[PDB]
Amino acid sequence: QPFQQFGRDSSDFTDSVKDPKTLEILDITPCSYGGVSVITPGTNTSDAV
Amino acid sequence: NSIAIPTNFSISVTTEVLPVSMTKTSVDCNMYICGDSTECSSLLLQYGS
Ligand SMILES: *[C@@H]1O[C@H](CO)[C@@H](O[C@@H]2O[C@H](CO)[C@@H](O[C@@H]3O[C@H](CO)[C@@H](O)[C@H](O)[C@@H]3O)[C@H](O)[C@H]2NC(C)=O)[C@H](O)[C@H]1NC(C)=O
Ligand SMILES: *[C@@H]1O[C@H](CO)[C@@H](O[C@@H]2O[C@H](CO)[C@@H](O[C@@H]3O[C@H](CO)[C@@H](O)[C@H](O)[C@@H]3O)[C@H](O)[C@H]2NC(C)=O)[C@H](O)[C@H]1NC(C)=O
Ligand SMILES: *[C@@H]1O[C@H](CO)[C@@H](O)[C@H](O)[C@H]1NC(C)=O
C-alpha cells in the first residue's frame, strides 16, 4: 500500500524497501543463509578437509 | 468349597506406542544475536564466552 517506506517482519527484521528515486520495491536477504559443516580426520592425521 | 475353572480361551492383540527420539537442532549466536553488524559482533566478543 502507499505511504510505506519500509518492509517489516514478525521478527522486526527488514526484508523489503521502497526506492525513493525509482519508486519501486526492493528485497533484502542476508549475505549468509545456509549452514556449512566441515569434516576433518584429525590434526595428526592430515590437513585435508 | 467352590472353585471356578475357565473352559474357553480367546486371542487378543493390543498396541502400545513409545517415543524413541526427537528432532536435532543447532544455534548460531553471531546470527541470532547481532545480525549483520560488525560493532555488535565486537561487543558480543567482548562480552565473553
Ligand atoms: C528524481 O526524482 C524524480 C521524481 O521526483 C524522477 O523523475 C524521473 O526522471 C527519470 C530520469 O531517468 C525519468 O525517466 C525517463 O523517462 C523517459 C521514459 O520515456 C525517458 O526520458 C528515459 O528513458 C527515462 O526512463 C522519469 O520519467 C521521471 N519521472 C517523471 C517525469 O515522472 C527521477 O528518477 C529522479 N531524477 C534523476 C534520477 O535524475
Ligand atoms: C468355545 O470354544 C469352542 C471351540 O473350542 C468354540 O466353538 C466353535 O467356535 C467357532 C469359532 O469360529 C465356531 O465357528 C463358527 O460357526 C458358525 C458356523 O455356522 C459360524 O458362525 C462361523 O462361520 C464359524 O464357522 C463354531 O461353530 C463353534 N462350535 C460350536 C459347536 O459352537 C466356541 O465358539 C467357543 N465359545 C465362545 C462363546 O466363543
Ligand atoms: C600427535 O602426534 C604426536 C607425534 O608424536 C603425538 O606424540 C601426540 O600425542 C599426538 N597428539 C594428540 C593430541 O594425539
Side-chain angles (χ1 to χ4, degrees):
Chain A
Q1 78 291 333
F3 296 156
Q4 172 183 320
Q5 295 285 331
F6 48 89
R8 288 298 97 179
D9 196 5
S10 301
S11 61
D12 293 2
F13 180 77
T14 182
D15 53 352
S16 294
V17 66
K18 185 181 69 183
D19 195 315
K21 187 161 294 189
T22 48
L23 275 299
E24 53 93 18
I25 306 296
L26 282 77
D27 64 327
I28 295 95
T29 302
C31 200
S32 303
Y33 168 77
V36 173
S37 299
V38 171
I39 296 93
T40 185
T43 307
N44 264 322
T45 305
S46 175
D47 294 328
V49 297
Chain B
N1 49 14
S2 68
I3 182 65
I5 294 93
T7 58
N8 225 323
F9 57 91
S10 60
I11 302 298
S12 61
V13 174
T14 60
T15 178
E16 183 172 292
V17 181
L18 289 87
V20 174
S21 63
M22 64 181 186
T23 62
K24 311 180 302 179
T25 176
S26 181
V27 176
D28 197 328
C29 288
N30 197 25
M31 195 169 181
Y32 176 73
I33 311 178
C34 307
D36 292 328
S37 180
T38 60
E39 303 85 3
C40 200
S41 299
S42 59
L43 262 58
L44 180 58
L45 185 143
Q46 181 266 356
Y47 184 89
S49 173

